[PDB]
Ligand binder design. Structure first.
Ligand SMILES: Nc1ncnc2c1ncn2[C@@H]1O[C@H](COP(=O)(O)OP(=O)(O)CP(=O)(O)O)[C@@H](O)[C@H]1O
Ligand SMILES: [Mg+2]
Length: 359
């Protein structure tokens, strides 16, 4: 009588529940799912190059030079690729459910492997030529029965790929469109500094020396870069495992609480703010601040309706202790720059009082 919808069947029935929408956002989610999976290699230290190709037929190719996708037989008894590609827990399997076809070309374990999924169903793993080379290529063709549009937007892809490249300084991402060949290449050796530079271009940076520092702990790693501009508002970009957390969370909060205390204490020693005067607020310190906070968490939990909010309690305290130590170093290290960004803080506090008094 009743029908229970499990696995990939559910995804097809309510794709939006998993992807977002059956519109542009959802369509591009297929790419995000796959490219993410590739970049996770580059992040771990195995991939160096990730190539995205928008094929003429409307397919997408995503090739990396990581360790490949395990082909070896899984605990289930079916090859590990098949598990990844046909079973939930989001993750790339969803791409399979929502494509008419998915083709995987692997090089692991001394040869070339090829597996095809026709309407999510595996057609049988094939072993080819021997090779000492390692990595994976994924091809998928979005199902038009699912999506309102199947046309990918070059520029939306390019923007995301660009930021993935800032977050990973060892990585090179090549985007190429075979429709309408138009190509873009993203590699930033400066990493998060090249990111800050990018942000503060149109804005006039207040000080020349850009803040760059790192921290490593238990199941987490952080990397921060910041530079103030003549701006009246902040531009702080936060990331957890290359995922852009617009909602922000514990990594951003640890950073804020550290920066707020570092600036205030520094000001007191320099006598920049009158001891009698109340401590500068979080808002006045970040007035015109451009920053990037990129954490690497081993097991990350996200909260918020968006699911773009890092919730790891463990991380708030970690980022805080890292900033407290390294920002104190950068302040004392650059007394020139410190004097400017503090005065900017003072100006930001005086501007709020000026609006209050008159009128
Ligand atoms: N190109 C690649 N190189 C190496 N391993 C890959 C890979 N593509 C897939 N995998 C393997 O399969 C998994 C991808 O499955 P899935 O997308 O469900 O999980 P995930 O670890 O990517 C996080 P999420 O499910 O949130 O996307 C990876 O965790 C990895 O173990
Ligand atoms: Mg995934």
């Amino acid at each position: 009588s009743i029908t229970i919808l499990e696995g990939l069947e559910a995804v097809r029935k309510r794709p939006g529940m998993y992807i977002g929408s059956t519109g542009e956002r959802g369509l591009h989610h297929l790419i995000w799912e796959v490219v993410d999976n590739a970049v996770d290699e580059a992040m771990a230290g195995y991939a160096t190059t990730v190539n995205v190709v928008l094929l003429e037929d409307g397919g997408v190719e995503v090739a990396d030079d990581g360790r490949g996708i395990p082909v070896a037989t899984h605990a289930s008894g079916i090859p590990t690729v098949d598990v990844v590609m046909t079973q939930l827990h989001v993750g790339v399997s969803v791409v399979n459910a929502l494509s008419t076809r998915l083709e995987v070309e692997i090089k692991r374990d001394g040869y070339e492997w090829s597996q095809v999924y026709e309407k999510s169903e595996p057609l049988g793993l094939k072993q080819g030529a021997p090779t000492k080379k390692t990595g994976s290529t994924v091809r998928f063709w979005a199902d038009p029965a699912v999506f309102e549009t199947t046309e990918y937007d070059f520029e939306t892809v390019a923007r995301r790929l660009q930021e993935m490249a800032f977050l990973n300084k060892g990585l090179t991402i090549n985007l190429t469109d075979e429709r309408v060949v138009k190509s873009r290449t993203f590699h930033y050796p400066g990493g998060l500094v090249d990111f800050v530079k990018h942000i503060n271009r149109t804005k006039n940076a207040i000080h020349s020396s850009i803040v760059d520092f790192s921290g490593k702990g238990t199941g987490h790693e952080v990397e921060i870069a910041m530079q103030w501009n003549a701006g009246y508002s902040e531009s702080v970009h936060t990331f957890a495992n290359t995922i852009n957390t617009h909602e922000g969370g514990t990594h951003e909060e640890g950073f804020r609480s550290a920066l707020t205390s570092v600036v205030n204490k520094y000001a007191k020693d320099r006598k920049l703010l009158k001891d009698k005067d109340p401590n500068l607020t979080g808002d006045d310190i970040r007035e015109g601040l451009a920053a990037v906070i990129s954490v690497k968490v081993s097991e990350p939990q996200f909260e918020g309706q968006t699911k773009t909010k890092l919730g790891n309690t463990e991380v708030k305290s970690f980022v805080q202790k890292v900033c407290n130590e390294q920002l104190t170093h950068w302040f004392e290290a650059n007394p020139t720059d410190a004097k400017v960004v503090v005065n900017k803080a003072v100006s930001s506090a005086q501007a709020r009082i000026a609006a209050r008094k008159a009128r």
